Amino acid sequence: FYCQGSIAGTPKGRSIRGTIQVDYDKCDPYRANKFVKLLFTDTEGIPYTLYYGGYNQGWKPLKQSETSTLLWKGTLDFGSTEAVNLNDSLDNYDLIEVTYWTRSAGHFSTKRLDIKNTSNLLYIRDFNISNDSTGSSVDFFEGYCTFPTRTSVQPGMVKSITLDGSTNTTKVASWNEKERIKVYNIMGINRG
Amino acid sequence: SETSTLLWKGTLDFGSTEAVNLNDSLDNYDLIEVTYWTRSAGHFSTKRLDIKNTSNLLYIRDFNISNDSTGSSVDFFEGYCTFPTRTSVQPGMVKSITLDGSTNTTKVASWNEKERIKVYNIMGINRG
Amino acid sequence: SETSTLLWKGTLDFGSTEAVNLNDSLDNYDLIEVTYWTRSAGHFSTKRLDIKNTSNLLYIRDFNISNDSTGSSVDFFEGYCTFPTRTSVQPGMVKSITLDGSTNTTKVASWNEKERIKVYNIMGINRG
Amino acid sequence: LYTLSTNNNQIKMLYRFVSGNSSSEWQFIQGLPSNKNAVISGTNILDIASPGVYFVMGMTGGMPSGVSSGFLDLSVDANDNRLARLTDAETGKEYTSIKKPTGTYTAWKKEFEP
Amino acid sequence: LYTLSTNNNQIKMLYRFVSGNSSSEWQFIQGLPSNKNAVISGTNILDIASPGVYFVMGMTGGMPSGVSSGFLDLSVDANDNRLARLTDAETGKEYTSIKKPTGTYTAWKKEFEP
């Protein structure tokens, strides 16, 4: 099948191309329930499913399949000053995800950003407590990258603070230094 | 395959006192995910909640440090929504605290105030 | 397509010591996700980890603030799992600290106690 | 800090060190009334919650069965771990009960005898 | 004498009587932080060398095997005889160890069980 993107219930107003599977329960079209399954793709290649259950269950909600495309990889330290270029425009994506690290104990994690609903700042925030049965000290890390273009990222700021548990005082443990917050990868993500 | 459906869209301030409807029941989904904002430095982010393994309280937690070369303060944000029905979300609390790095002292910076934590969309998600 | 498989399910308390064995190798996944909880106020949430770009340590970090109009204290919760094998997971540590907002001082509130941080599932995920 | 009461259970000494807006915790001192272990009576023994060594007598409930008075050594941490050690003033039998942070008190466990 | 620290393991009160050159010893006083027994964590339990009752947890060593946490009641006389009794917070089981003036602590004995 083919459906024109102006018909109601199409995804994102795009035309779609796909296949349809139809059956009646136990192959009895005179007495039985009817079932319908659709599997289809839009002008951007995104795959969707749509399903009708028999026994008057009717239509289940539209299910876009989440799809991802690497936009960048390397070692982007928030203490660096260069921009990095993304392999496709952020405008083709509904989220990004970044993998990141912080200096303390070698912590690694991810952070997700909704590119259609953002201040255009990729913020990272994280903390570390002392890893022994006696210390009360805490470390904080924060920093962000701007987007200079819809195809690029640049480190705007990185900072850290320590709450010293011995004196009970905070101190700045870094300002605009490398080896404090790092991003290794950036992913473009499609979602519903 | 991981699949996603929009359950709601708008701007849900946690200091608001109103529910918002969801386009389908929470019971059809394995997770929810939300885009959100927090006051300090105009931050935007996403939060995930498992609908099967939960207290039926969507919390947001976040924190912000002083954005200058000298400050040593930390501000904290916490807030939550209840689900008054399997088809709605309502704010239940929002609070903030400042650890002031100039005095080395903590204080309550807000309690049930607007402009602290906000959600822009809620996605229902299906997974393995 | 992002695709997911359930590797393990249960209640992996970070105060426990025991390894658990996973149904499939973590090498076959680009990420894991884990649904988790922390003692304070019955928070529930999910952590994602890239299983390529990692120290091979699944941390959880969280904090709670006093849920009333008057307390300024902040509770910090941290712990990790370790991967002794690409088919096993083992809790390395759990700890909590309180910043006391009445004296303006910091203290250890727990160390390798059960009931502080808990993981209810491990999902293996593939991504592009 | 000193509480201003003639009631021998309410009179308390506390102290602390203060630096700016920060301080130690309050250090609650335990004093012995007429140099003795303080008496508690007419109550359920499981309602008692401060650390210390009391004498318990005429209690309304939560004693071990048949025990009518005794020394109660109670210990309590900031997480609310508790350790109660009662000793029966008639037979000299110890009874122990514990509360975990997330639990209530367990029932009494008697000591070991042949 | 009062030490100037916000740390509950370091805020000490001491008193004595002085006459010319002579005095009593310093009588040490232990407070209860927030009305609780003093927690100890992140040490070997055999590095505790002050009397009193302490909730011990996360101890890096010297515990009885499989005892993670408990109440420790320690006695230490002027000669450095010591008696340690540890009661395990999971089970209520007592363990004991002893030290002589000219020796180190023994291993842990356990209470007997049915």
Automatic annotation (TrEMBL), chains B, C:
This is CBM-cenC domain-containing protein. It comes from Staphylococcus phage 812.
TrEMBL record, chains D, E:
It comes from Staphylococcus phage 812. It comes from the Viruses. This is Receptor binding protein. The chain holds residues 116 to 229 of 458 of the full protein.
